[PDB]
Amino acid sequence: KRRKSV
Amino acid sequence: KRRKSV
Amino acid sequence: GAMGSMERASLIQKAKLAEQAERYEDMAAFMKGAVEKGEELSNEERNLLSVAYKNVVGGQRAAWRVLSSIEQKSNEEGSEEKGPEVREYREKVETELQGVCDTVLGLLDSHLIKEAGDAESRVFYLKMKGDYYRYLAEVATGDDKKRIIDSARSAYQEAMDISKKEMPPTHPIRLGLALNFSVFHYEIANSPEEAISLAKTTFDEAMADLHTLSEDSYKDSTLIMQLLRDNLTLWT
Amino acid sequence: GAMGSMERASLIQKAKLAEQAERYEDMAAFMKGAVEKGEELSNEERNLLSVAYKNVVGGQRAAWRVLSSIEQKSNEEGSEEKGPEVREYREKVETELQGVCDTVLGLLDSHLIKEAGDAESRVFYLKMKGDYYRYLAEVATGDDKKRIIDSARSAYQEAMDISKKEMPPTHPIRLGLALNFSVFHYEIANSPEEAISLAKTTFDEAMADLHTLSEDSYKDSTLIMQLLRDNLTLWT
Ligand SMILES: COC[C@H]1CC[C@@H]2/C1=C\[C@]1(C)C(=C(C(C)C)C[C@@H]1O)[C@@H](O)[C@H](O)[C@@H]2C
Ligand SMILES: COC[C@H]1CC[C@@H]2/C1=C\[C@]1(C)C(=C(C(C)C)C[C@@H]1O)[C@@H](O)[C@H](O)[C@@H]2C
Ligand SMILES: [Mg+2]
Ligand SMILES: [Mg+2]
Ligand SMILES: [Mg+2]
Ligand SMILES: [Mg+2]
Ligand SMILES: [Mg+2]
Ligand SMILES: [Mg+2]
């Protein structure tokens, strides 16, 4: 759903 | 698991 | 002081936004500013006040319990001495928690309780006064612990007595008060029997009054009655 | 200033406790105090610093997006004028968010970056510098928005160049930098093609290096590679 960042 | 309060 | 220059209605509007944003510290400060306007709160404003502090203090309590458990494990036979940090940091969290409880109890005493003449407002505020003395009791260990507990007990008891005279057995505030007073019995006053009897009698009396309700009131009351049932299941 | 009188090791010990308690604001203040001791951070301390601010700022970003969406809906044709509160409260949250980003960027510039000579420290700090300029860019609307974006780009680019020369394609920091730089391309610099190419090339180069790893390193790298894959799936 929401793009991933880390 | 943990008793309920409100 | 800090919300002194904002309109009451603006602080209310902002508390609702902060709720939506899950910014409960903000929500709580906005509602404190709204109470400090000196006017009585409506039903919906009382709910905003209680949800804001409930969430703030609920986060502090959970943190304090994580830290208390660590602290206790460090005091066990065979544990390596890791110095004072756990105890210091638990004390910091604990002090901030006590400050929140004192602030809520301060708003109640100045001057929400004394101007609350309807059952639904007065029982609501006395329940909150019992809750915040109860959160105080959860962390109390000194000379005043008995007085803290009895202040929780007394506030819940006056709320119970008014709710029994003035509200139907199914009223959500009556039901939530009894749920919390029964938790107080169970884990603060070391009276698990009273805790169980109160939750049982409360549940049973609510059941027999369900028939008087609309479908929406039914939903509201049974939601709380399930929390009473969950506790009875856990405790028996 | 505020953590000036606490031992470095105590602040570290307390950051780890605050993490356990999910008290990320506390965790972040403890790690700020630890950085301000002036000594370089170890690998594990860099991770504590980054997790603390990541969580603090991640809560503010989520709140800002809830509030920005409300604000935008209030500016739609046919909406009732509800005055300035939504915009005021969004601006408050936004200002606090910018303050956190400025504080992290301040720690990086004074003096983490300049003393970081190993690849793993220097790429880690430059990635964080790109991240915090990126969070700045997410809320920027004025005269400096282009410069903010380019500061994010430049920091990510120098991190990329060092990571490509000095680290294996599977290194978690190299992988996390590329994930975030690809997000920057996609939603900040309006370059979805660059975003996709970067995530794809990064994933593919990591795949071909998996064979060099132990089982634990394998686990660490594939965990990040999946986040690259999740983005490619969403974006294509
Ligand atoms: C002072 O103690 C307030 C506490 C007593 C029971 C319940 C309370 C709080 C909030 C505001 C509500 C619920 C739910 C049961 C929906 C959880 C919310 O925290 C209201 O909807 C209920 O009508 C009711 C007032
Ligand atoms: C500066 O950007 C740091 C960011 C780049 C990738 C990843 C980062 C943060 C943290 C500390 C880790 C993970 C997971 C992948 C476990 C999420 C955590 O936030 C570390 O375990 C990784 O080794 C690695 C350093
Ligand atoms: Mg006015
Ligand atoms: Mg030993
Ligand atoms: Mg009155
Ligand atoms: Mg020292
Ligand atoms: Mg209209
Ligand atoms: Mg060095």
XYZ file of C-alpha atoms and ligand atoms in Angstrom:
540
model
C 0.000 0.000 0.000
C 2.590 2.665 1.095
C 6.073 2.435 -0.611
C 8.877 1.168 1.685
C 11.783 3.089 3.058
C 14.215 2.044 5.806
C -4.235 -11.578 28.366
C -4.272 -8.137 30.146
C -7.501 -7.300 32.137
C -9.715 -4.620 30.506
C -10.355 -1.124 31.682
C -12.029 1.733 29.787
C -1.601 29.198 30.650
C -0.203 28.169 27.254
C -3.571 27.910 25.430
C -4.817 31.082 27.082
C -4.812 33.105 23.881
C -6.701 30.469 21.732
C -10.479 30.455 21.357
C -12.299 27.702 23.239
C -13.924 26.471 20.053
C -10.566 26.460 18.219
C -8.973 24.366 21.021
C -11.900 21.904 20.687
C -11.560 21.814 16.911
C -7.804 21.210 17.334
C -8.277 18.431 19.926
C -10.417 16.576 17.334
C -7.705 17.028 14.673
C -5.003 15.828 17.073
C -7.142 12.783 17.851
C -7.371 12.078 14.085
C -3.607 12.429 13.878
C -3.100 10.287 16.942
C -1.266 13.191 18.536
C -2.567 12.539 22.040
C -0.152 14.824 23.946
C -1.357 17.696 21.709
C -4.974 16.569 22.103
C -4.530 16.635 25.894
C -2.955 20.104 25.939
C -5.765 21.474 23.737
C -8.437 19.995 26.027
C -6.612 21.259 29.137
C -6.734 24.736 27.523
C -10.424 24.241 26.838
C -11.193 23.251 30.443
C -9.168 26.228 31.683
C -11.617 28.486 29.810
C -13.790 27.955 32.869
C -16.977 26.884 31.071
C -18.576 23.437 31.708
C -17.849 20.725 29.132
C -20.439 19.161 26.901
C -20.781 15.329 26.648
C -18.653 15.153 23.540
C -15.989 17.522 25.098
C -15.833 15.331 28.218
C -15.237 12.383 25.958
C -12.394 14.296 24.153
C -10.781 15.224 27.489
C -10.929 11.643 28.792
C -9.626 10.024 25.571
C -6.691 12.469 25.361
C -5.372 11.822 28.858
C -6.259 8.135 28.759
C -4.001 7.664 25.788
C -1.193 9.865 27.163
C -1.177 8.180 30.478
C -1.755 4.752 28.919
C 1.533 5.136 26.941
C 3.387 6.184 30.127
C 1.955 3.239 32.130
C 2.963 0.726 29.525
C 6.485 2.191 29.450
C 6.708 2.225 33.225
C 5.730 -1.471 33.290
C 8.361 -2.411 30.687
C 10.957 -0.528 32.839
C 9.722 -1.875 36.196
C 10.017 -5.442 34.887
C 13.570 -4.793 33.732
C 14.397 -3.201 37.077
C 12.927 -6.159 38.993
C 14.893 -8.676 36.899
C 18.118 -6.714 37.698
C 17.409 -7.069 41.439
C 17.173 -10.923 41.195
C 19.813 -13.239 42.817
C 22.631 -13.893 40.265
C 22.024 -10.717 38.194
C 24.961 -8.549 37.132
C 25.052 -5.114 38.768
C 24.395 -2.642 35.957
C 24.331 0.478 38.149
C 21.573 2.999 38.615
C 20.389 3.664 35.067
C 17.287 1.396 35.002
C 16.088 2.818 38.327
C 16.850 6.398 37.216
C 15.014 6.012 33.907
C 12.042 4.210 35.577
C 11.910 7.110 38.066
C 11.954 9.659 35.213
C 9.068 7.931 33.409
C 7.321 7.530 36.761
C 7.663 11.204 37.646
C 6.283 12.283 34.260
C 3.408 9.872 34.711
C 2.648 11.323 38.181
C 2.744 14.807 36.688
C 0.055 13.873 34.139
C -2.140 12.313 36.844
C -1.689 15.477 39.012
C -2.608 17.683 36.091
C -5.865 15.719 35.403
C -6.722 15.630 39.126
C -6.024 19.372 39.202
C -8.480 20.020 36.331
C -11.079 17.904 38.094
C -10.645 19.742 41.369
C -10.333 23.175 39.632
C -13.171 23.258 38.781
C -14.902 20.508 36.778
C -16.293 18.458 39.693
C -17.767 21.296 41.658
C -19.782 22.645 38.733
C -20.972 19.239 37.516
C -24.588 18.852 38.767
C -26.038 16.326 36.235
C -25.487 12.635 36.874
C -23.776 12.034 33.593
C -21.180 14.769 34.093
C -20.636 14.238 37.769
C -20.256 10.405 37.518
C -17.978 10.822 34.488
C -15.602 13.208 36.371
C -15.614 11.153 39.582
C -14.777 8.035 37.558
C -11.790 9.925 36.023
C -10.751 11.086 39.528
C -10.789 7.367 40.620
C -8.856 6.346 37.479
C -6.049 8.923 37.953
C -5.686 8.174 41.689
C -5.609 4.499 40.574
C -2.725 5.233 38.164
C -0.986 6.993 41.033
C -1.563 3.885 43.183
C -0.013 1.614 40.549
C 3.361 3.313 41.066
C 3.075 4.304 44.746
C 5.497 2.629 47.232
C 5.794 5.126 50.144
C 4.103 6.735 53.178
C 1.057 7.952 51.183
C 0.237 4.782 49.224
C -2.715 3.924 51.516
C -4.158 7.466 51.211
C -3.770 7.367 47.385
C -5.666 4.041 47.216
C -8.383 5.323 49.499
C -8.740 8.486 47.417
C -9.279 6.244 44.349
C -11.763 4.126 46.321
C -13.673 7.177 47.596
C -13.984 8.786 44.216
C -15.196 5.516 42.584
C -17.630 4.946 45.502
C -19.308 8.383 45.194
C -19.549 7.809 41.380
C -21.080 4.339 42.006
C -23.647 5.761 44.476
C -24.759 8.535 42.087
C -24.780 6.183 39.076
C -26.905 3.651 40.952
C -29.469 6.313 41.900
C -29.546 8.286 38.635
C -28.584 6.109 35.699
C -29.866 2.960 34.083
C -27.859 -0.171 34.690
C -26.962 -0.244 30.994
C -25.631 3.334 30.747
C -22.081 3.174 29.211
C -20.613 5.465 31.915
C -22.170 3.346 34.673
C -20.807 0.230 32.983
C -17.287 1.684 32.392
C -17.107 2.936 36.012
C -17.980 -0.492 37.333
C -15.451 -2.141 35.001
C -12.692 0.159 36.335
C -13.756 0.042 39.998
C -13.720 -3.813 39.687
C -10.148 -3.604 38.230
C -9.216 -1.322 41.187
C -10.565 -3.995 43.579
C -8.725 -6.740 41.801
C -5.273 -5.297 41.437
C -4.979 -2.303 43.684
C -7.014 -3.138 46.836
C -6.130 -6.833 46.770
C -9.849 -7.809 46.814
C -10.317 -10.160 43.907
C -13.665 -11.370 45.339
C -15.120 -7.873 45.408
C -13.736 -7.343 41.866
C -15.555 -10.455 40.594
C -18.843 -9.781 42.440
C -18.925 -6.210 41.185
C -18.257 -7.235 37.538
C -20.806 -10.063 37.755
C -23.619 -8.086 39.421
C -22.962 -5.207 37.000
C -23.077 -7.483 33.933
C -26.243 -9.313 35.121
C -28.162 -6.087 35.918
C -27.209 -4.673 32.544
C -28.405 -7.876 30.753
C -31.868 -7.574 32.331
C -32.213 -3.898 31.137
C -31.103 -4.518 27.475
C -34.735 -4.938 26.443
C -35.430 -1.213 27.086
C -32.837 -0.090 24.496
C -32.765 0.913 20.853
C -30.422 -1.041 18.595
C -27.711 1.708 18.854
C -27.876 1.916 22.670
C -27.840 -1.960 22.715
C -24.596 -1.885 20.727
C -23.070 0.751 23.067
C -23.922 -1.137 26.285
C -23.034 -4.664 25.095
C -19.631 -3.368 23.936
C -18.766 -2.527 27.623
C -20.514 -5.607 29.011
C -18.120 -7.735 26.916
C -15.127 -6.073 28.693
C -16.784 -7.055 31.992
C -17.120 -10.603 30.660
C -13.506 -10.673 29.443
C -12.337 -9.794 32.987
C -14.621 -12.398 34.635
C -13.193 -15.025 32.203
C -9.625 -14.056 33.000
C -10.211 -13.912 36.755
C -12.227 -17.108 37.282
C 23.092 20.746 26.669
C 20.471 18.848 28.688
C 22.326 15.490 28.809
C 25.625 17.228 29.468
C 25.931 15.948 33.019
C 25.163 12.229 32.177
C 27.880 9.707 31.359
C 28.126 8.696 27.706
C 27.708 5.043 28.592
C 24.668 5.813 30.784
C 23.010 7.750 27.908
C 23.635 4.708 25.652
C 22.262 2.327 28.265
C 19.203 4.601 28.629
C 18.624 4.864 24.851
C 18.387 1.033 24.768
C 15.875 1.058 27.654
C 13.807 3.775 25.968
C 13.806 1.702 22.781
C 12.493 -1.277 24.813
C 9.825 0.989 26.252
C 9.025 2.432 22.859
C 9.839 5.861 24.244
C 11.411 7.161 21.046
C 11.507 10.880 21.966
C 13.500 9.893 25.089
C 15.647 7.504 23.041
C 16.422 10.354 20.623
C 17.333 12.827 23.374
C 19.638 10.253 25.009
C 21.401 9.556 21.695
C 21.667 13.292 20.938
C 23.385 13.634 24.349
C 25.662 10.749 23.443
C 26.662 12.290 20.098
C 27.277 15.625 21.829
C 29.937 13.872 23.939
C 32.109 14.403 20.880
C 33.350 10.819 20.487
C 32.664 8.801 17.279
C 29.768 6.327 17.414
C 30.144 2.596 17.153
C 28.034 0.564 14.646
C 25.457 -0.333 17.250
C 25.318 3.337 18.534
C 24.768 4.587 14.971
C 21.919 2.146 14.695
C 20.425 3.459 18.018
C 20.713 7.075 16.820
C 19.045 6.317 13.476
C 16.191 4.226 14.950
C 15.397 6.899 17.569
C 15.006 9.767 15.117
C 13.435 7.575 12.450
C 10.623 6.721 14.797
C 10.224 10.282 16.133
C 10.137 11.797 12.738
C 8.078 8.918 11.330
C 5.286 9.720 13.865
C 5.421 13.431 12.919
C 5.296 12.650 9.163
C 2.300 10.411 9.532
C 0.517 13.104 11.564
C 1.434 15.797 9.072
C -0.028 13.657 6.260
C -3.296 13.072 8.145
C -3.508 16.892 8.677
C -2.443 17.833 5.129
C -5.169 15.585 3.702
C -7.770 17.215 5.929
C -6.493 20.653 4.951
C -6.623 19.786 1.235
C -10.194 18.464 1.522
C -11.211 21.782 3.208
C -9.837 23.725 0.215
C -12.038 21.753 -2.282
C -14.946 23.426 -4.207
C -18.170 23.112 -2.111
C -16.396 22.724 1.272
C -17.599 24.706 4.287
C -15.148 27.347 5.511
C -13.968 26.128 8.911
C -11.433 28.917 9.499
C -7.724 28.669 10.103
C -7.439 25.855 12.641
C -6.490 22.973 10.282
C -3.803 25.111 8.632
C -2.543 26.366 12.019
C -2.330 22.869 13.500
C -0.712 21.436 10.307
C 1.826 24.288 10.525
C 2.516 23.493 14.204
C 3.135 19.802 13.457
C 5.150 20.842 10.406
C 7.343 23.231 12.374
C 8.069 20.588 15.024
C 8.907 18.128 12.281
C 11.323 20.639 10.676
C 12.918 21.197 14.071
C 13.656 17.464 14.424
C 15.128 17.298 10.906
C 17.297 20.398 11.686
C 18.484 18.832 14.908
C 19.555 15.568 13.136
C 21.193 17.525 10.292
C 22.932 19.612 12.960
C 24.353 16.487 14.665
C 25.530 15.204 11.302
C 27.229 18.466 10.426
C 28.561 18.966 14.015
C 30.498 16.728 13.852
C 29.584 13.153 12.879
C 30.220 13.398 9.114
C 33.579 15.066 9.270
C 35.073 12.471 11.609
C 33.582 9.465 9.808
C 36.413 7.976 7.674
C 35.273 4.309 7.291
C 32.829 3.473 4.522
C 30.262 2.027 6.839
C 30.096 5.101 9.074
C 30.405 7.675 6.359
C 27.755 6.077 4.054
C 25.442 5.579 7.046
C 25.621 9.303 8.038
C 25.305 10.572 4.457
C 22.240 8.361 3.973
C 20.700 9.932 7.137
C 21.605 13.419 5.820
C 19.714 12.525 2.557
C 16.768 11.124 4.558
C 16.341 14.239 6.762
C 16.673 16.651 3.809
C 14.100 14.356 2.115
C 11.698 14.776 5.068
C 12.258 18.513 4.786
C 11.435 18.273 1.060
C 8.171 16.444 1.765
C 6.806 19.548 3.508
C 8.650 22.286 1.583
C 6.532 24.688 -0.561
C 8.626 27.909 -0.783
C 11.713 29.636 -2.247
C 14.162 26.993 -0.922
C 12.326 23.810 -1.953
C 14.672 23.217 -4.928
C 17.788 23.678 -2.739
C 16.360 21.289 -0.084
C 15.741 18.601 -2.745
C 19.188 19.067 -4.206
C 20.764 18.818 -0.753
C 18.960 15.458 -0.321
C 20.109 14.383 -3.795
C 23.728 15.417 -3.148
C 23.972 13.649 0.157
C 22.461 10.409 -1.275
C 24.767 10.671 -4.337
C 27.996 10.945 -2.283
C 26.758 7.981 -0.134
C 26.004 5.986 -3.332
C 29.476 6.728 -4.784
C 31.297 5.651 -1.596
C 29.056 2.593 -1.131
C 29.661 1.489 -4.718
C 33.444 1.743 -4.293
C 33.763 0.350 -0.756
C 30.911 -1.995 0.053
C 29.531 -5.213 -1.328
C 26.321 -4.956 -3.287
C 24.564 -6.941 -0.560
C 25.640 -4.764 2.395
C 22.450 -3.742 4.337
C 23.484 -0.050 4.449
C 24.159 -0.039 0.698
C 20.795 -1.709 0.136
C 18.861 0.630 2.512
C 20.496 3.719 0.935
C 19.469 2.604 -2.523
C 15.929 1.834 -1.329
C 15.615 5.381 0.087
C 17.375 7.161 -2.792
C 14.951 5.307 -5.168
C 11.988 6.554 -3.026
C 13.490 10.093 -3.245
C 13.574 9.741 -7.059
C 10.050 8.458 -7.178
C 8.224 10.905 -4.983
C 10.430 13.890 -4.416
C 12.344 14.434 -7.705
C 9.450 13.322 -9.901
C 11.665 10.702 -11.638
C 9.788 7.446 -11.369
C 11.976 5.883 -14.106
C 15.181 6.570 -12.206
C 13.463 5.241 -9.040
C 12.604 1.948 -10.782
C 15.993 1.514 -12.515
C 17.839 2.163 -9.275
C 15.696 -0.338 -7.287
C 15.974 -2.942 -10.060
C 19.736 -2.649 -10.658
C 20.286 -2.643 -6.879
C 18.144 -5.763 -6.351
C 19.757 -7.650 -9.288
C 23.352 -6.867 -8.199
C 22.533 -7.959 -4.673
C 21.006 -11.268 -5.947
C 24.228 -12.147 -7.796
C 26.351 -11.569 -4.601
C 24.116 -13.641 -2.205
C 26.295 -16.693 -2.808
C 29.229 -15.066 -0.932
C 27.228 -14.773 2.324
C 26.748 -16.753 5.508
C 23.185 -17.716 6.393
C 22.872 -14.730 8.833
C 24.197 -12.166 6.322
C 21.860 -13.789 3.689
C 18.913 -13.154 6.010
C 20.008 -9.523 6.620
C 20.423 -8.681 2.909
C 17.310 -10.475 1.595
C 15.208 -8.659 4.220
C 16.103 -5.291 2.513
C 15.959 -6.734 -1.004
C 12.300 -7.633 -0.333
C 11.553 -3.923 0.419
C 13.137 -3.117 -2.964
C 10.888 -5.750 -4.541
C 7.794 -4.436 -2.738
C 8.444 -0.966 -4.236
C 9.061 -2.349 -7.760
C 5.731 -4.269 -7.468
C 3.862 -1.176 -6.353
C 5.446 1.066 -8.986
C 5.191 -1.168 -12.067
C -14.577 8.849 32.228
O -14.589 7.515 31.703
C -15.082 7.535 30.307
C -15.330 6.093 29.837
C -16.532 5.433 30.542
C -17.149 4.492 29.451
C -16.944 5.253 28.139
C -15.675 6.107 28.336
C -14.892 6.680 27.327
C -15.011 6.801 25.927
C -14.984 8.364 25.659
C -16.222 6.036 25.336
C -15.712 4.788 24.928
C -16.249 3.576 24.183
C -16.958 2.566 25.037
C -16.800 3.874 22.787
C -14.211 4.628 25.163
C -13.817 6.091 25.178
O -12.576 6.232 25.849
C -17.641 6.715 25.316
O -18.140 6.548 23.976
C -18.561 5.946 26.253
O -19.838 6.505 26.004
C -18.229 6.101 27.775
C -18.266 7.580 28.190
C 21.075 5.240 8.217
O 20.137 4.302 7.674
C 20.125 3.074 8.501
C 19.315 1.986 7.780
C 20.019 1.456 6.515
C 19.610 -0.056 6.451
C 19.543 -0.488 7.918
C 19.159 0.773 8.717
C 18.630 0.810 10.013
C 18.397 -0.152 11.017
C 19.238 0.358 12.261
C 18.680 -1.607 10.564
C 17.436 -2.116 10.145
C 16.902 -3.464 9.685
C 17.069 -3.750 8.221
C 17.100 -4.606 10.684
C 16.281 -1.128 10.300
C 16.866 -0.250 11.386
O 16.209 1.007 11.373
C 20.145 -2.177 10.635
O 20.042 -3.451 11.297
C 20.638 -2.429 9.217
O 21.860 -3.120 9.404
C 20.912 -1.137 8.376
C 21.942 -0.240 9.080
Mg -13.628 33.524 23.375
Mg 28.003 -12.362 36.749
Mg -23.409 22.963 36.352
Mg 32.647 10.509 31.163
Mg -22.270 24.621 2.836
Mg 37.311 8.831 12.426
